[PDB]
Amino acid sequence: QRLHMLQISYFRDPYHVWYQGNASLGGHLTHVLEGPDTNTTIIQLQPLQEPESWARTQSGLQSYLLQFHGLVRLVHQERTLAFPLTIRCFLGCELPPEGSRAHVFFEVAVNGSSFVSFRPERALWQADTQVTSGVVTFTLQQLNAYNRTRYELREFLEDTCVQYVQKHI
Amino acid sequence: NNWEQQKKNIEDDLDRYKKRAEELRKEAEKARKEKEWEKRCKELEERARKLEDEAKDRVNDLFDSNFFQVIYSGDNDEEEWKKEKDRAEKEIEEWFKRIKEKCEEIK
Numbered sequence: 004q005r006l007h008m009l010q011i012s013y014f015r016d017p018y019h020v021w022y023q024g025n026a027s028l029g030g031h032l033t034h035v036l037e038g039p040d041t042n043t044t045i046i047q048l049q050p051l052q053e054p055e056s057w058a059r060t061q062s063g064l065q066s067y068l069l070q071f072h073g074l075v076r077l078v079h080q081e082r083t084l085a086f087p088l089t090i091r092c093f094l095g096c097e098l099p100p101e102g103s104r105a106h107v108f109f110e111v112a113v114n115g116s117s118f119v120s121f122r123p124e125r126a127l128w129q130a131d132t133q134v135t136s137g138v139v140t141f142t143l144q145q146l147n148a149y150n151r152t153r154y155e156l157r158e159f160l161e162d163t164c165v166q167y168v169q170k171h172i
Numbered sequence: 173n174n175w176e177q178q179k180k181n182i183e184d185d186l187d188r189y190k191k192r193a194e195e196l197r198k199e200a201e202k203a204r205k206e207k208e209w210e211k212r213c214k215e216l217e218e219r220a221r222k223l224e225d226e227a228k229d230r231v232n233d234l235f236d237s238n239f240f241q242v243i244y245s246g247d248n249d250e251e252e253w254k255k256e257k258d259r260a261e262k263e264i265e266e267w268f269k270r271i272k273e274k275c276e277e278i279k
């Protein structure tokens with residue numbers, strides 16, 4: 004079946020964000036995320052992962068949230084963002100009944116409207132907006148600039164996420 | 173100049189945790205140049221490891237936050253950011269070895 008993740012980031016200003024999110028494995032809620040930039044707390048509702056494994060998963064997730072906020076700050080200092088704003092990140096992996104060819108995704112919405120999405124075939128981010136703006140071109144420029152935002156993001160989706168589905172259904 | 177300011181903050185943390193690590197190394201040298209003192213070793217092993225972890229987490233948090241500011245500078249890149257991050261991680265580790273060594277010797 005599948006692993007879907009939702010992340011909602013509330014920016015009052017460039018310096019501070021409030022996170023709210025959840026994850027659902029095979030249609031069941033499994034994880035919850037809540038808190039501000041400094042103290043964002045991530046908990047698993049079921050003991051799917053052993054304490055050591057889960058601690059490594061949290062380290063990874065917590066590093067992502069620092070990095071994510073950093074990118075928002077850069078886009079703002081370079082192209083100026085209009086605050087307050089809300090960023091929705093909907094991502095996951097879906098496994099077929101037969102075959103290993105898994106469908107994977109990462110769609111980003113800003114203030115309820117489509118913004119950018121990841122395309123795993125070439126590990127490149129694309130615009131989901133009809134509007135041509137400095138913010139969209141710059142964000143995509145940065146997103147397609149690094150191995151972190153490209154092959155590492157794809158590896159999370161195609162390997163980390165998929166393996167989790169295979170292990171914990 | 174954003175990243176310039178942020179490197180200064182990274183430096184401060186390391187410089188603080190360095191002087192905190194030597195505050196402990198001198199405690200471990202005054203107790204070896206001397207059973208109960210042997211527990212003064214567990215208390216030094218504990219305070220030293222707890223200190224390391226804090227130092228390692230606060231500094232990594234700094235690096236992860238300055239991912240795009242440092243790599244967007246132009247004469248710094250992903251490889252060099254990951255290089256610098258490990259260069260600092262191993263700088264902290266080194267001090268723990270300095271302390272632990274004293275204890276293991278005095279054993």
Ligand SMILES: CCCCCCCCCCCCCCCCCCCC(=O)O[C@H](COC(=O)CCCCCCCCCCCCCC)COP(=O)(O)OCCN
Nearest residue numbers: 008010024025026034067070071151152158159163164167
């Ligand atoms: C199977 C997973 C584990 C099971 C647990 C499930 C999760 C439990 C928590 C529930 C809540 C879920 C919500 C969190 C969202 C997803 C977080 C994961 C993202 C992540 O770590 O991806 C890394 C990439 O990060 C980066 O690339 C960092 C930079 C940030 C990119 C931002 C992308 C959107 C751009 C829009 C922002 C700009 C705004 C402009 C107006 C990959 O790394 P990995 O190390 O994990 O890889 C493994 C290979 N070793």
Ligand SMILES: *[C@@H]1O[C@H](CO)[C@@H](O[C@@H]2O[C@H](CO)[C@@H](O[C@H]3O[C@H](CO)[C@@H](O)[C@H](O)[C@@H]3O)[C@H](O)[C@H]2NC(C)=O)[C@H](O)[C@H]1NC(C)=O
Nearest residue numbers: 007008009010011023024025026027030031032035091115
């Ligand atoms: C993870 O947290 C989510 C918080 O946003 C939430 O998922 C969905 O979020 C949207 C808000 O953007 C809401 O969607 C709509 O749901 C019903 C349709 O059934 C509408 O009548 C509502 O007016 C609302 O706009 C909901 O809050 C929620 N969606 C649903 C279907 O409940 C969930 O709490 C978490 N995700 C899951 C899948 O449980």
Ligand SMILES: *[C@@H]1O[C@H](CO)[C@@H](O[C@@H]2O[C@H](CO)[C@@H](O[C@H]3O[C@H](CO)[C@@H](O)[C@H](O)[C@@H]3O)[C@H](O)[C@H]2NC(C)=O)[C@H](O)[C@H]1NC(C)=O
Nearest residue numbers: 014015083084085086087088089090112113114115116138
């Ligand atoms: C994301 O959604 C936000 C909520 O809809 C929106 O915030 C609102 O932003 C505008 C402009 O920055 C603020 O209004 C200002 O502009 C009008 C123009 O006629 C002036 O008359 C007002 O005096 C005022 O200065 C709103 O105050 C602000 N809303 C809140 C709750 O503060 C963001 O702009 C949206 N951001 C993006 C990037 O789309």
Ligand SMILES: *[C@@H]1O[C@H](CO)[C@@H](O[C@@H]2O[C@H](CO)[C@@H](O)[C@H](O)[C@H]2NC(C)=O)[C@H](O)[C@H]1NC(C)=O
Nearest residue numbers: 022023035036037038039040041042043044045
């Ligand atoms: C940890 O983060 C939060 C907010 O800064 C603090 O703890 C609580 O965590 C919940 C998470 O849902 C918050 O909504 C609450 O506002 C917090 N307080 C209570 C009474 O529940 C906590 O103080 C932070 N810790 C540190 C050390 O800063």
